[PDB]
Amino acid sequence: GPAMRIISVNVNGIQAAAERGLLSWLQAQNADVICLQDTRASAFDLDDPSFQLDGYFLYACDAELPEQGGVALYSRLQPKAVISGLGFETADRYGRYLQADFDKVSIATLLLPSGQSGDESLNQKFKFMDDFTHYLSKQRRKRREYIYCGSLYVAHQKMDVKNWRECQQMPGFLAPERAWLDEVFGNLGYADALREVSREGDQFSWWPDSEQAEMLNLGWRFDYQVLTPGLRRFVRNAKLPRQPRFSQHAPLIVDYDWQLSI
Ligand SMILES: [Cl-]
């Protein structure tokens, strides 16, 4: 019966990640759609034939200054349409959004700023958040379903971070950041794909770049597949494997009881 697999990875530079084996690992995962974030590549850079995956169409969107963003989406089916951007600057100037439309459902790749390099960067992250809330408050009135493969740089609940008491003071688990996700998953009615099938802790998707973070698992769950409520009962499995990886982020692999078509 019906099945679809969607894999989402923040690659922290698609060339750096590819040099680490990302593409041959993806080729083998049996994904219907792959969503990448933070490619750091220009449209011309992504024209390099070694980024193509056999059996997949590849779409991308680049940041004005390519290193500041970029996202991409591979699909086995040729989507009905692909659109980029969200209609606000902290997305559109940074290639932080791209969407593929299928029958009844669109699947997107979404990237936020991390807000980790000072107050200016955190201002930019809060503004993106607020503008994205506004977009979702309108979009939830549409009839089609959406799967937002999102690299959010925000962990929602205590179980989504290791040592929540120290994290509370750092970008990623600030009170207004947790509040934003409470709004997304609460009043706005969206679903957290992994949380529809698992309430266990110790499932993280990002680690600072240090051997001590790696040995002690000082991880944060920053990567999600955020769902329209019509898809919430279709989730089958979700996994954030610690290995292999290609960046500071783990891949998020989610299977759904849904037969993708165009
Ligand atoms: Cl906010």
Residue numbers in the entry: 1 to 262
Could you pull the original sentences from the published paper?
Crc controls the sequential assimilation of amino acids and inhibits the expression of several genes involved in uptake and catabolism of sugars, alkanes and benzoate. Thus Crc protein seems to operate at the crossroad of metabolism and virulence in P. aeruginosa. Crc shares sequence similarity (25 to 37% identity) with DNA repair enzymes belonging to the family of apurinic/apyrimidinic (AP) endonucleases of both Prokaryotes and Eukaryotes. However, Crc does not appear to have nuclease activity.
